[PDB]
Enzyme design. Structure first.
Site, mmCIF file in Angstrom:
data_model
loop_
_atom_site.group_PDB
_atom_site.id
_atom_site.type_symbol
_atom_site.label_atom_id
_atom_site.label_comp_id
_atom_site.label_asym_id
_atom_site.label_seq_id
_atom_site.Cartn_x
_atom_site.Cartn_y
_atom_site.Cartn_z
ATOM 1 N N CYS B 1 0.829 -1.267 0.000
ATOM 2 C CA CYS B 1 0.000 0.000 0.000
ATOM 3 C C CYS B 1 0.814 1.244 0.000
ATOM 4 C CB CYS B 1 -0.814 0.098 1.261
ATOM 5 S SG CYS B 1 -1.413 -1.533 1.685
ATOM 6 N N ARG B 17 -4.832 6.401 -2.143
ATOM 7 C CA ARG B 17 -4.068 5.208 -1.717
ATOM 8 C C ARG B 17 -4.129 4.064 -2.756
ATOM 9 N NH1 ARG B 17 -4.206 1.065 1.548
ATOM 10 N NH2 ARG B 17 -6.085 1.447 2.757
ATOM 11 N N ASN B 81 -0.700 -1.730 5.556
ATOM 12 C CA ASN B 81 -0.268 -2.911 6.221
ATOM 13 C C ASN B 81 1.025 -2.661 6.923
ATOM 14 O OD1 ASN B 81 0.097 -6.429 5.491
ATOM 15 N ND2 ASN B 81 -1.279 -5.395 6.891
#
EC number: 2.3.1.-
Lengths: 316, 316, 316, 316
Positions: B1, B17, B81
């Site tokens: 990410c 994102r 993450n």
């Protein structure tokens, strides 16, 4: 600019290109039907029955100057910028097939059905570049691909070079050979998860994905783009339907796109990927999106009357 | 990410994102209207009148688990993450505002109007992570941005860290600090055309654009992506209308997208950018495209009844 | 192997080189006196009054086989490994001066006084490689320098390439043109202290010296050494005494040394800088140290009976 | 500065370091005899029967100020520049052992016999930096090693960090944790010959040794040296005699040397490896060479009157 090709499991052509520059305008999807009458600038040979052709270009006189184009039998050609290296005669040469640089893409698309043929006839082709005073001379090299393989045509001061393009990509300068040697530096870059290993007592692990790929350059210069799209093209897993293959072509091309702000040209303006075009011989369709709009538009040959005698432009 | 934000000339939020992973399904644009009744898992404070919220998520119970979301006053939050680094208590702590990790994005969006406020109240917030046996614990860090600035929340074994994010980007591991130190390596990477210069008698020139950028890593590991999107975000030239700013957000995010084939995860599957979402406080609109389809879809808050009491999902 | 040349401010020769290999071939310092009678393997013309010669090499037949050597008038020559690119005829060509590969270093040193003269003769030289049963051809290219400049001789499948060596440096594969192009990637590397610059609101400064040099590769492959030792040699400040120039020569070479453990070659053994040698024309002295001992020993020409007629080896 | 430690197969100490700076401070080899009476600037406890000490340093007051030093029982210590991170109190803390910064190297060497003992005491040590008018505090971190292992002491704004140094190497800024994380980027670099692999139809092979090492940085900034000298030291094969271990120590250090011209520091002057020193516990000998002369001179402890009571400086 960047060019790419690959295949599916059934021998079909997927081919495309980024057009990278400060600014463009006027180029459009341009159709060239079988029944259009083409007179070749230096009376180069034809082919009794011409292939239907689609690409991206602009019309000058009543001719299509294609940036890139494809025909109805899976052959595709793109021209990409090559100044400092490309170099041409300005005068036809007797009893060779003399083709004008700006017409080379139409000529290849229209008259040939495979890379084998193009390559065969290039052995007696003279790429002619004619000067218009105060207009800048177009200085290209070309990427040519079908369902099986690609070649790269680099016409230079020392003569014409036709290279078998085993990595199936091309970008800009310097020579094809330099790029092929340069890849050897990145031999170890890998798509595997990096294996835990130790330096002395220190145990090293990857935080997550991508570490085995460490070593690939990320700048947008011509050699780095060559290494980065060569890598991406070669490791992308084979796909087997139209949608996945178009998606594969665009992502691959996207791996080396030029974003605004990244890189100035010799004139202090940013170079950006203005547009990305592509071609599927499986559906005889051309595809295109742009810096302003990533939605992928399609242009199926089947939607145009390939027996007419008119150039057709579409947008916008 | 990867997370990014920037502004226009008028103080408006642009935020987005990439969601990078082997595979996803079920996530959708998810609307959370003012009149929806939210009960907070550990009875954390609210705000008499909740903000309208839109994002990307899935509904579990009758709650929105947002991957990322924004509110009607320009505040946006994403979770990315962070295993190996994120670490949480599993038990509320008395007389702190106790918020469940999975609800943190709704909670921030709903109750706060600026990074100033979020930051203020985090000083007394406890991020609680509850174990479900056999379900994997979600291990995130968060990127939070408004029209002026962003912060990064990293909850770790040694405590909560709130960092002012001066480069306006976040990716994955290791700590924010490592990334900020690591950028110092690439201080000289430049967007200028590289100036002719000499080594001894040898005169060196750039072939074209991008050479001054040489030195930026191109792999898709978490640190390299941080360096590459930090650079791209910081040099992208200010834009001043919605379209150009949305286009700026997507290209920027695109600079670090994960292409299939590039990089295996610890399970031998390729990580890809499954989707890219974004938010404009100038139009209170959320945006999204996917690996399968780059066309950018819009979801304007104005199209939903923000006084209703129902979660709304849309697609597909 | 690296080879390097530079000058002082009075026009003297500083030339030296690393020998990189797995195991010593018993090489030694080797004087070849003026009254040594030498018969050229293919009857290449000599010159009536031969130059005094010192270098490093082995004796086979009663022939001097030089790795590198330099004459009493400041011309010096090194042969460096080039398999995969080097390629030679095995039979003399009529009315060319036909020189054997292994006698080339001696031949050029004994008969020529400057790079001009050598470059001039090279136009009529045929380099011939003798087949020697179940041994492999040694396949070299050559580094030649005096007090003014440097050339590189690369005899390949397609002919003798003789290059003016503007960076004054040489390594191994691929071709010299490739290395010169490759340098262009590194044209922004700097020996200046990197100056504080900003990415968005992040202020970046260098921890200390070195940051502006970031981008130079560190591995010991042939193209990386080429880049690293070109950088070093172009940026080292001029020196005008003997001590400091000798020191410059060994520090420069040292920056591309191969340390035990760093890199295995084809056979499984670690390649290493077995020795480093160089030569000064201010003082007609050859210098050398070895992997096993970095003490630089010197071997003045004036300490050998130059009019002698047997060739001497030294050690200890 | 680099510091490095390793062992033979019998558990002896090999420890050494580069001193990198613009100009010499007049440093010298320096014996500190057992019967030298030393008063600790802040009354840190000693030990009744002090160790014999050799090292490199200057004399101020009649105090020994060591850059690095090692004792008669194989423990050795180096101080390396750390501005921007290092940070000290200026007043003793009651009932801690209070050691002055500049006396730390002597203090640890005279009083301790292994890394275990030092690590144990460090738990109650206060490192104090004396303000000295219009001079700047020296701001160091420290590298400490015996025949088994290595530690790193980093005293910072937030407290004393003591790290087990698994790669056996240290450089300058930023913190030790940053370097250890950073190593992870390079976990795929290899000293094996790179094996032929393919990208699509292109077959890639290495030109020669070194290609598998590609990815290691070559500049002389502090984090790059950290990576390069960690790699080198972890991959150098074990040696079991004195000559070869001394050689290993200097070759390893040499791989991160700063050559004239490569990098300017803040003042505009080139930073350079002014000298390199190291120590063997098989033979209680300190070794050293300098930028100006690579001959390694040795200084056996047994050649000094250890029960003496004046401290000796040597040269020439």
């Amino acid at each position: 600019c960047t060019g790419v090709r690959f295949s599916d499991d059934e021998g079909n052509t997927y081919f495309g290109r980024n057009l990278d520059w400060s600014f463009s305008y006027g180029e459009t999807i341009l159709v060239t039907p079988r029944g259009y009458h083409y007179d070749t600038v230096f009376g180069a040979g034809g082919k009794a029955k011409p292939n239907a052709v689609i690409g991206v270009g602009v019309v000058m006189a009543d001719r299509p100057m294609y940036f890139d184009c494809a025909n109805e039998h899976g052959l595709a050609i793109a021209g990409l910028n090559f100044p400092g290296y490309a170099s041409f005669v300005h005068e036809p040469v007797e009893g060779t097939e003399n083709v004008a640089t700006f017409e080379f893409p139409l000529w290849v698309a229209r008259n040939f059905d495979s890379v084998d043929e193009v390559e065969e006839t290039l052995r007696n082709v003279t790429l002619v570049s004619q000067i218009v005073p105060g207009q800048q001379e177009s200085l290209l090299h070309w990427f040519i691909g079908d369902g099986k393989r690609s070649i790269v045509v680099e016409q230079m001061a020392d003569g014409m070079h036709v290279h078998h393009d085993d990595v199936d990509v091309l970008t800009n300068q310097p020579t094809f050979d330099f790029h092929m040697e340069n890849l050897r530096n990145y031999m170890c870059v890998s798509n595997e998860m990096a294996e835990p290993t130790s330096w002395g007592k220190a145990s090293l692990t990857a935080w997550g994905a991508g570490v085995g790929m460490h070593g690939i350059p990320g700048d947008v210069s011509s050699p780095s783009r060559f290494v980065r799209v060569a890598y991406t093209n070669a490791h992308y897993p084979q796909q087997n339907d139209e949608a996945a293959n178009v998606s594969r072509l665009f992502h691959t091309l996207g791996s080396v796109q030029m974003v605004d702000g990244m890189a100035k040209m010799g004139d202090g303006q940013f170079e950006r990927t203005l547009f990305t075009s592509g071609y599927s011989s499986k559906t005889n369709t051309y595809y295109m999106n742009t810096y302003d709009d990533p939605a992928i538009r399609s242009y199926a040959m089947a939607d145009y009357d390939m027996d007419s005698s008119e150039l057709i432009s579409v947008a916008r």
